[PDB]
Amino acid sequence: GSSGSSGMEEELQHSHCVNCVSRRCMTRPEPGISCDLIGCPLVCGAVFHSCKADEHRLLCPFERVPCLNSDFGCPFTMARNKVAEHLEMCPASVSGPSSG
Numbered sequence: 001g002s003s004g005s006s007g008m009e010e011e012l013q014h015s016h017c018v019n020c021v022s023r024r025c026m027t028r029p030e031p032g033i034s035c036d037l038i039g040c041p042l043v044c045g046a047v048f049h050s051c052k053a054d055e056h057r058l059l060c061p062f063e064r065v066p067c068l069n070s071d072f073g074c075p076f077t078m079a080r081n082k083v084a085e086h087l088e089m090c091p092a093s094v095s096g097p098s099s100g
């Protein structure tokens with residue numbers, strides 16, 4: 001009788017990608033140096049390396065983000081850029097039409 005398993009997942013950064021700002025990069029994707037490029041899954045309008053994506057999302061505006069005033073308790077959620085349209089009619093904005 002016996003029993004046992006094996007398997008270890010681990011990935012590192014890409015020397016190339018890590019140093020690749022150009023969105024329209026066309027460098028042969030090498031296993032260890034540079035990976036294939038992929039367009040944002042939110043059609044935000046940016047081209048980054050599949051590996052960078054994870055990081056890009058952090059910046060990408062489209063990325064689903066909670067109301068700027070999430071602290072107050074706004075159950076609303078939308079793109080970082082589409083936060084205004086909501087903030088205008090948002091309760092956690094305490095911003096009246098006060099004009100002149």
Ligand SMILES: [Zn+2]
Pocket residue numbers: 016017020025026027034049
């Ligand atoms: Zn690149």
Ligand SMILES: [Zn+2]
Pocket residue numbers: 014017034035036049050051052
């Ligand atoms: Zn990469």
Ligand SMILES: [Zn+2]
Pocket residue numbers: 040041042044045046056057060061062
């Ligand atoms: Zn994006």
Ligand SMILES: [Zn+2]
Pocket residue numbers: 067068069074076086087090091092
């Ligand atoms: Zn809100």
